[PDB]
Amino acid sequence: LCIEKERDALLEFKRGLSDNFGQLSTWGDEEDKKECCKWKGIECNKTTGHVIVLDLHNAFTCSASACFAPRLTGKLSPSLLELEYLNFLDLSVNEFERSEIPRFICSFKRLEYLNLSSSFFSGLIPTQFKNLTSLRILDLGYNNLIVKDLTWLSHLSSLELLSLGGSDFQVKNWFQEITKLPLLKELDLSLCGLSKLVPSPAEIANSSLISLSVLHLCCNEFSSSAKYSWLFNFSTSLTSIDLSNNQLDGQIDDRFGNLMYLEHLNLANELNLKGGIPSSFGNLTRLRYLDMSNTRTYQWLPELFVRLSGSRKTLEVLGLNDNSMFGSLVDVTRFSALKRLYLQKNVLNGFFMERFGQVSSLEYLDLSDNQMRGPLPDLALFPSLRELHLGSNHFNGRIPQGIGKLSQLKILDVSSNRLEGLPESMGQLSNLESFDASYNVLKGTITESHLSNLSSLVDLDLSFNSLALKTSIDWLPPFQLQVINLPSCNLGPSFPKWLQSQNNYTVLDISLANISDALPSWFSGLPPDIKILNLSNNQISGRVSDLIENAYDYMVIDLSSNNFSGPLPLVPTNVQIFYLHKNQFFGSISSICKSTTGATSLDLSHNQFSGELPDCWMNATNLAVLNLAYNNFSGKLPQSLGSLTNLEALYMRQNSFSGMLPSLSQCQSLQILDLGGNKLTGRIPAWIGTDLLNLRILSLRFNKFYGSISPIICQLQFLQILDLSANGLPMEFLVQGFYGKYPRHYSYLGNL
Amino acid sequence: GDYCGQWDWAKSTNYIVYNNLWNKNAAASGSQCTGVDKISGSTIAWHTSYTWTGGAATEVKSYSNAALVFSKKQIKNIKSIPTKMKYSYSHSSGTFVADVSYDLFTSSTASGSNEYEIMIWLAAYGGAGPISSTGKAIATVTIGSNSFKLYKGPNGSTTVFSFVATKTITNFSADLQKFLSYLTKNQGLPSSQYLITLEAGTEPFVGTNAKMTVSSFSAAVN
Ligand SMILES: *[C@@H]1O[C@H](CO)[C@@H](O[C@@H]2O[C@H](CO)[C@@H](O[C@@H]3O[C@H](CO[C@H]4O[C@H](CO[C@H]5O[C@H](CO)[C@@H](O)[C@H](O)[C@@H]5O[C@H]5O[C@H](CO)[C@@H](O)[C@H](O)[C@@H]5O)[C@@H](O)[C@H](O[C@H]5O[C@H](CO)[C@@H](O)[C@H](O)[C@@H]5O[C@H]5O[C@H](CO)[C@@H](O)[C@H](O)[C@@H]5O)[C@@H]4O)[C@@H](O)[C@H](O[C@H]4O[C@H](CO)[C@@H](O)[C@H](O)[C@@H]4O[C@H]4O[C@H](CO)[C@@H](O)[C@H](O)[C@@H]4O)[C@@H]3O)[C@H](O)[C@H]2NC(C)=O)[C@H](O)[C@H]1NC(C)=O
Ligand SMILES: *[C@@H]1O[C@H](CO)[C@@H](O[C@@H]2O[C@H](CO)[C@@H](O[C@@H]3O[C@H](CO[C@H]4O[C@H](CO[C@H]5O[C@H](CO)[C@@H](O)[C@H](O)[C@@H]5O)[C@@H](O)[C@H](O)[C@@H]4O)[C@@H](O)[C@H](O[C@H]4O[C@H](CO)[C@@H](O)[C@H](O)[C@@H]4O[C@H]4O[C@H](CO)[C@@H](O)[C@H](O)[C@@H]4O)[C@@H]3O)[C@H](O)[C@H]2NC(C)=O)[C@H](O)[C@H]1NC(C)=O
Ligand SMILES: *[C@@H]1O[C@H](CO)[C@@H](O[C@@H]2O[C@H](CO)[C@@H](O[C@@H]3O[C@H](CO)[C@@H](O)[C@H](O)[C@@H]3O)[C@H](O)[C@H]2NC(C)=O)[C@H](O)[C@H]1NC(C)=O
Ligand SMILES: *[C@@H]1O[C@H](CO)[C@@H](O[C@@H]2O[C@H](CO)[C@@H](O)[C@H](O)[C@H]2NC(C)=O)[C@H](O)[C@H]1NC(C)=O
Ligand SMILES: *[C@@H]1O[C@H](CO)[C@@H](O[C@@H]2O[C@H](CO)[C@@H](O)[C@H](O)[C@H]2NC(C)=O)[C@H](O)[C@H]1NC(C)=O
Ligand SMILES: *[C@@H]1O[C@H](CO)[C@@H](O[C@@H]2O[C@H](CO)[C@@H](O)[C@H](O)[C@H]2NC(C)=O)[C@H](O)[C@H]1NC(C)=O
Ligand SMILES: *[C@@H]1O[C@H](CO)[C@@H](O[C@@H]2O[C@H](CO)[C@@H](O)[C@H](O)[C@H]2NC(C)=O)[C@H](O)[C@H]1NC(C)=O
Ligand SMILES: *[C@@H]1O[C@H](CO)[C@@H](O)[C@H](O)[C@H]1NC(C)=O
Ligand SMILES: *[C@@H]1O[C@H](CO)[C@@H](O)[C@H](O)[C@H]1NC(C)=O
Ligand SMILES: *[C@@H]1O[C@H](CO)[C@@H](O)[C@H](O)[C@H]1NC(C)=O
Numbered sequence: 001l002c003i004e005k006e007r008d009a010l011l012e013f014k015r016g017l018s019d020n021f022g023q024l025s026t027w028g029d030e031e032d033k034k035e036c037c038k039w040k041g042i043e044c045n046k047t048t049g050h051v052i053v054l055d056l057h058n059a060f061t062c063s064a065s066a067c068f069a070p071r072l073t074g075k076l077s078p079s080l081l082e083l084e085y086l087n088f089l090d091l092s093v094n095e096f097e098r099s100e101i102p103r104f105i106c107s108f109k110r111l112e113y114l115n116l117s118s119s120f121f122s123g124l125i126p127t128q129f130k131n132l133t134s135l136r137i138l139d140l141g142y143n144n145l146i147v148k149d150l151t152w153l154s155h156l157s158s159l160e161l162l163s164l165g166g167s168d169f170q171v172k173n174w175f176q177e178i179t180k181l182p183l184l185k186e187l188d189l190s191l192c193g194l195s196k197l198v199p200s201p202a203e204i205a206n207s208s209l210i211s212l213s214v215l216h217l218c219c220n221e222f223s224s225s226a227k228y229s230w231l232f233n234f235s236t237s238l239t240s241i242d243l244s245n246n247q248l249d250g251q252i253d254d255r256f257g258n259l260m261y262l263e264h265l266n267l268a269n270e271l272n273l274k275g276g277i278p279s280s281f282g283n284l285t286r287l288r289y290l291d292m293s294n295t296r297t298y299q300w301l302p303e304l305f306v307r308l309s310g311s312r313k314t315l316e317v318l319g320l321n322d323n324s325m326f327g328s329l330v331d332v333t334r335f336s337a338l339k340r341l342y343l344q345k346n347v348l349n350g351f352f353m354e355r356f357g358q359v360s361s362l363e364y365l366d367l368s369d370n371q372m373r374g375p376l377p378d379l380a381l382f383p384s385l386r387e388l389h390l391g392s393n394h395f396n397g398r399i400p401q402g403i404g405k406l407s408q409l410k411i412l413d414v415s416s417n418r419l420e421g422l423p424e425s426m427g428q429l430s431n432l433e434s435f436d437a438s439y440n441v442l443k444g445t446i447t448e449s450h451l452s453n454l455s456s457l458v459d460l461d462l463s464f465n466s467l468a469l470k471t472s473i474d475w476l477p478p479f480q481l482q483v484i485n486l487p488s489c490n491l492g493p494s495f496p497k498w499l500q501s502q503n504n505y506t507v508l509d510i511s512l513a514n515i516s517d518a519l520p521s522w523f524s525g526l527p528p529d530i531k532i533l534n535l536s537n538n539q540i541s542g543r544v545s546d547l548i549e550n551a552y553d554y555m556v557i558d559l560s561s562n563n564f565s566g567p568l569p570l571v572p573t574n575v576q577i578f579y580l581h582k583n584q585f586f587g588s589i590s591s592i593c594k595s596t597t598g599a600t601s602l603d604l605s606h607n608q609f610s611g612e613l614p615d616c617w618m619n620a621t622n623l624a625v626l627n628l629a630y631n632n633f634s635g636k637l638p639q640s641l642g643s644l645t646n647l648e649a650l651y652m653r654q655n656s657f658s659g660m661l662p663s664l665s666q667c668q669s670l671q672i673l674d675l676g677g678n679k680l681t682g683r684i685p686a687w688i689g690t691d692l693l694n695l696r697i698l699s700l701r702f703n704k705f706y707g708s709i710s711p712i713i714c715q716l717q718f719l720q721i722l723d724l725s726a727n728g729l730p731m732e733f734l735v736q737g738f739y740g741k742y743p744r745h746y747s748y749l750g751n752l
Numbered sequence: 753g754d755y756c757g758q759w760d761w762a763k764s765t766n767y768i769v770y771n772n773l774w775n776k777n778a779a780a781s782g783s784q785c786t787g788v789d790k791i792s793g794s795t796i797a798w799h800t801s802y803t804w805t806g807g808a809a810t811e812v813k814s815y816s817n818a819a820l821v822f823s824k825k826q827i828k829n830i831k832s833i834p835t836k837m838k839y840s841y842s843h844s845s846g847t848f849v850a851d852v853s854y855d856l857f858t859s860s861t862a863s864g865s866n867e868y869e870i871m872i873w874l875a876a877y878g879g880a881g882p883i884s885s886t887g888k889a890i891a892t893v894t895i896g897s898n899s900f901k902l903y904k905g906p907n908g909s910t911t912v913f914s915f916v917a918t919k920t921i922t923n924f925s926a927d928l929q930k931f932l933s934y935l936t937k938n939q940g941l942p943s944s945q946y947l948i949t950l951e952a953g954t955e956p957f958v959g960t961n962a963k964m965t966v967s968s969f970s971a972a973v974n
Contacts (some may be wrong), residue, residue: 020846062883063811064775065869065907066955068849069879093887095879118887142888144918166889191889219891245890247938269890269940294940553758574758598757622761646763669763732863736759737774741815742866742910 002036003049009079010036010051017074017096023056051083055090057115064741071095071119078104087112095120098144103128115139117163124148130155141165141188150177157181163188165216175199175230179208187212190242191219199230209233213261216242223247223271232259240264244291247271254280257307261286268293268319275299276325277307287311291319293342301327301348305334313337321345321366328353329367333360333381344368344389352377352395359383368392368413376419378402387411391436395419399437404428415439415461427452434459438485442467448475459483463509471498480504487534490514495523495540507532511558518542519564524549531555531737536579538562544569555737559583560603568592568604576735577601577746581627585609589628593619600733601625601748605651609633618643624733625748627651629674637662637680645669648731649748653677653699665691671731672749674699676723683707684729689715696731697721705729721752754787754799762788767796767969768821770951773814779807780958786816795970801963802956809849809958817855817951818966822973824862827932828943835971836925837874837952842963849878849957852964856928857910858945866948868941869907871914872900872931874921880957882914883907889916893934896926904939913939947973 007029014027026033026040036051037044043053060069072094081104089111098120105114106128112135122144130152137160146168153162160183169192171177178187194217212234222228228243232255239261248270256262257280267273268291276292276299287308297320304325308315313336321342328350332338336358344366351374352367354360360382366389373394379385380402387410395417404425410433419440426432427449438461445468451457457479462469467489471477477498484505491513499508500522508526511534519542526533529552536558543566544559554575560582567587571578578599586608593616605627612635617623623644629651636659637652649672657675660682664670668691681704688698689712696719705727713722731749738744755762761770771786782804790797800816839852852875858868871882883905891902893915900915913935917924928950935941950971954964 060879060881060887061810062905063808065871065883065910065912066812066851066957067881067883067887067905068810068957069881071879191892219889221891245939271940576759598759736770736772741772741774741812741907745863 001044001046001049002034003044003051005082006049006051007036009082010042012079013077016077017072019072019074021070023058023070023072045085048085050085052086053088054080054083054086055088055092055115056094057090057092058094060093069093076102078102080104081107085110089113090115091119092116092139093118098122100124101126101140101145106131108132108134110134112136112158116143118142120144125152127152132156134158137161139163139188141190143167147171147192150174153177154180157183159184161186163216164192165190165219167192169193169197172197173199173203175203175207179210181210182208184210184212186214186216188216189220190216194220195222195227198227204230204233207233211237213237214240216240218242218244218246218266221247224250225253229253235259238262242266244268245270248273248295251275252277254278257281257283257310259284263287263314264289266291267295270295273297276304279307281307282310284308284310286314288314289317289319290315291317292323293319293321294323296324298324298326301325301343302330303327305331308335311335316340318342329372330354331356332362333358336361338362339384340364342366343370346370348372350374354381363387363408365389376400380405383407385409389413390417391415393417399423399426401425407431410434410456412436422446422450424449424452426450427454429454431456433457434461436461438463438465440465444468445470448472448477451477451479454479457481461485462489464488469496471496473497476501483507485509486513488512493517495520499523503527506530509534510538511535512537514538515540519544519547523547528552534558536560536562540564543567548572554578555735568609570595571597571599571602573597575599579603580607581605583607587611588614590614593617595619598622600735601746603627605629605631607631611635613638615640617641621645624648628655629653632656634658636660639663642666648672648733650674655679661685663687668692669694671696673697675703676700677702679703681706684709684713684724686710686712689713692716695719699723700727701725703727754785754801756783756785760786764788764791764796766794766820767971768819769796769798769817770819771800771814771816775811775813778804778811778813780804780809780811780813781806782813784814784816784956789965794972795968796966797968798966799964800954801961803960803962804956805847805958805960809847812955812957815855815951815953815955816964817953818969818971820950820971820973822950824946824948825973826943827858827936827941827945827947830929830932830947830973832974833928833932833947833950833972834926834974835928835950835952835969837969838923838967840922840965840967841875841954842961842965843959844961847878848959848962849880850954850959850962851876851880852954853914853952854928855949855951855953856932857948858941859948860945862946862948864946864948866910868945869910869912870928870931870935871912872928873914873916874924876916876920878957880955882916883912884914890939895930895934898924898926902939913941 014024045052060067076096092115100123101121103126117139124146135156141163148170150171159181165188238259244266249272251274273295276297317340319342322345325346330353333354333356349371354377361384363384363386368389369392375397378400385406386408391413398421401423412435414437416439421444430453442465448471455478463485487509494517516539540562545566548569551573554572558579560579565584570591581603588611597620609631615638617640624646633655639662642663644667647667647670653674653676657678657680665687676699695716701723732745732747734743736743758773784802786800788798804813854872856870857866882903884903885905889901890904893900899918903914936943
């Protein structure tokens, strides 16, 4: 069906642009690419072969704090005039030469859809746009163009949609010039500086009274009903109004309720919509989407539901999140088409009751970071939930045995509530990806039926609860979980057997469980990319020298408070905090820093360690918390300690250290330095008062320091504790990759 | 001296220049090696260099940053957050995607989880752009001879405000208190938030044989 001149043209057009990522790879003069209409972004008329559709529009994907777009970064070539009959040209979200809109585009005379939005087209519209009389829909939004004369518009009578958002809009009288269009259903003027340009009552009188249906006015600095009052002249026939991000400080005009067909209203991210929706909202009848997020509307919730009762049956999405809305949540089931309701981060202090005797169709519900109390309702009434957010409240009771009826449920967050137990019926969810019921007051034993039939689980979080989790001995779980936080839960007297079967996890927190056997032999084949292993505070045994694997890019290893034994496991290469305290290790620590390590905090205290400290601490410069206290250590303090450019706390109490104290001049920043019971001798040196200006605790008790005291120690003046007996003379560190981009800050100062 | 470790750093008096390849394993088959050149009182000088190619090119790979440690002070009680920056940047071949940005954060408590994030991008290349829930700017602001477009979007719990320079700036200087206070008056950041971290570096998405040179990075909280 393909026409020759058109491929030739399309190919020369491609020759200018640099696709770089593809998109235009399927374009060529090749025999294999010989029908141009089966190419990406071209569609041809079925009978006449002339191309009718060209869209190189590109969306963009957002990851983390950044979002990315494959922009075309090319030159836009006039050979396209040869296409002759295209009703659709879309070059959205592409960067060309960030230049004038090319005038040849106006020389088409058969266009109906021109979308150049969200590119970088700059300068100002060519007046030649008045020649494009055939244009039904124009989008030129979110470019860098200035708009001072709107004269051409009068000629495009055919328009039914015009976006001029994101302009240097400086036109005194758009009202006249925009009412000149007989069929404009939709207008976008967002970020056009509309507030500076206010339609006069007079200019509104000399106007065409168009039947306008959808309006976008976001990003205009209105702040009062005045600069947007012109809107209500289309009261006859409106459906959407987007007045989001307007610094709106005032009560909403009761006019909105009066509009008969309003079905979509976004007033989100305002300054102060004092109160909230008025009583005229009871007259709205059909409505579908309301958004007063981040408006500080202080309104009683069920009176809002009264004032939306005009639309029990039409309202689909209600977004009242991050506001000061008080009250209780009663009979949300009455809203039969409500699918999304977002009430998080309000001031609600009441019960989640629902007694209507009807069933809701809520798929997404968020009542987090409130003050709510009372028990949950029978969730069997809310079967369509895909994600149920309820954290940071004060709910109580057990979780209802009807939660087992939530099949489409993927996410459940009931953290930081005072709930008291789990039903077996949530061994039926099978789509529950992430289940977090941490910091509650749950009591009881969780059997394998509790977690039966839940194949799609990847996050389990039951932290700091009064709970127990014992499976049957020969139970095989249907789930492999990347995140496993089960602190303060007794998982079995025996090391939980079910973890032999999990091989995809990357963060293991089994701490404060009651466990007492030796480390099983199978557990050595622990997944190769674990970043957080917290086995501490148990009675686990085995010599972990050969029972842990090394350099797996650890991030947090805490093996403290156990009955582990042996010599120190050789420290993995990329770990940052490595805690071995409160165990039965012994031997040299001559292996610590033979290999380079970036650990920022290691704690080796309360062991049976011995020997002379190796002189390799420049192979671990990154330490800021060193804790060797409460071990039997004999030897000179290694001069390598001078190599700790940042060290915040140095714990050396209760060793048998002898000799003089080594040069610590270069470790200018430190806050804690105790060497108690260390049997160390020499004069108290000058650099404690001289280079170590930073300092808060200094303990040199029960040593052998000969010589007099320098008075210069009075020049620190932030030192809070000084103890130098029996001699004869707000702090923390960071783990960097913890939360992805964001570091984590850990506190280590404790008993003062 | 330049150093290639994933979470390596280098405390330097007033400023700490962290290198974070916090996203190295993005299947991006490459390496990055950062490093400090000069110290001169309030002004520092540093560089990095990298070659991240392929895998996930939708993603950031690293944020080598120049950071301030300061008396964490409430937004209300900052008179001036003066800063300046001068750099030039060198790359080769094709598919160079990356940005150059400041990154500030705020929380309720002096030691709290990041609640607000303020990015101020001096440069956007190859299609790199800030997280935006809309794809479109909430507003355009002008500060100290620079024109900025503001985007806002969610990074999990953090609310990320991002200013993008219309002029890709190779010589920035300004008072970031004007930016912080603009947000407090107009978009809705509480003045009670505590300013936590000030960082300035680059986020690369793809690139080959790249090297940034920072002639100076003076910065303060007074
Ligand atoms: C000229 O060219 C221009 C340049 O392209 C054209 O401009 C484009 O027009 C398109 C329309 O033609 C636009 O496409 C539509 O986008 C909307 C955007 O809203 C949604 O996404 C926003 C960002 O989140 C998504 O984005 C990224 C990238 O994909 C993802 O990383 C995210 O994960 C997320 O993806 C989610 O969405 C899918 C969709 O189902 C899910 O299934 C996924 O699992 C993901 O979770 C965001 O703004 C919206 O979210 C709001 O609410 C969220 C929670 O609900 C909250 O997190 C957000 O922060 C935001 O919250 C705000 O509101 C809440 C209340 O809701 C408040 O509480 C809060 O305070 C905030 O105020 C939303 O997620 C999108 O909805 C559309 O999707 C429909 O249509 C497309 C096809 O067109 C399908 O692909 C969709 O699946 C869906 O299709 C059917 O399904 C719908 C029901 O699910 C149904 O209702 C539909 O009608 C349909 O039947 C489109 O994706 C495009 O954005 C726009 N681009 C630009 C740059 O302008 C221009 O049109 C053109 N000119 C012309 C044509 O004249
Ligand atoms: C490997 O695992 C082990 C064990 O899992 C880790 O070691 C543990 O780490 C835990 C986390 O740090 C830590 O728990 C925190 O302890 C802090 C200090 O506790 C003080 O307050 C409690 C009050 O508890 C009492 O009430 C509760 C509730 O009924 C009871 O359950 C208790 O039994 C008590 O009756 C006192 O008892 C203590 O004596 C101290 O005075 C707590 O502050 C902290 O709680 C904070 O976070 C909670 C998160 O949900 C939150 O609920 C709580 O309100 C606290 O809120 C904090 O954050 C907010 C916001 O900034 C702030 O305003 C608050 O002021 C507060 O800072 C935790 O409870 C364990 O104690 C600790 N165990 C050991 C042996 O050390 C180990 O760290 C880990 N390995 C690594 C490397 O991390
Ligand atoms: C919700 O809608 C009702 C009905 O539209 C509103 O009440 C009605 O308001 C109209 C105003 O135009 C009244 O109609 C006219 O009133 C004048 C006197 O003002 C009268 O002379 C005319 O003959 C005509 O009736 C109408 O009487 C009134 N009440 C009805 C219809 O029962 C109401 O104001 C809206 N609610 C809110 C909160 O605004
Ligand atoms: C595709 O091309 C055909 C003809 O090449 C178009 O058909 C004409 O359609 C109009 C209105 O439907 C009629 O008045 C003409 O009589 C038709 N002509 C012929 C020869 O059939 C058709 O509309 C085109 N469609 C598109 C989408 O381009
Ligand atoms: C816009 O439309 C008018 C109307 O057709 C065009 O003006 C014509 O220009 C040609 C050029 O030689 C003349 O022969 C006609 O007599 C003109 N007609 C009228 C009514 O003035 C104008 O050229 C068009 N602009 C573009 C860029 O095509
Ligand atoms: C094992 O865990 C990894 C992640 O640590 C899973 O990998 C990703 O899973 C998400 C889930 O939707 C996908 O979107 C990604 O495409 C996956 N990426 C990679 C590189 O695999 C992985 O699927 C898990 N495997 C099993 C069998 O559970
Ligand atoms: C600091 O770490 C380096 C490794 O980065 C150690 O160097 C290795 O030493 C062994 C024998 O001791 C040699 O066989 C290797 O060839 C060396 N490797 C490298 C890369 O140099 C070094 O010994 C450590 N320093 C101290 C004082 O322990
Ligand atoms: C326009 O709106 C004002 C106030 O809303 C009203 O007084 C005026 O008569 C309206 N004109 C038309 C034609 O609707
Ligand atoms: C899971 O539950 C469903 C519903 O009763 C049932 O069809 C299925 O066989 C169950 N599977 C197992 C392994 O119990
Ligand atoms: C262990 O320390 C004690 C003092 O705390 C000391 O008496 C004993 O000799 C030490 N063990 C040695 C030196 O082997």
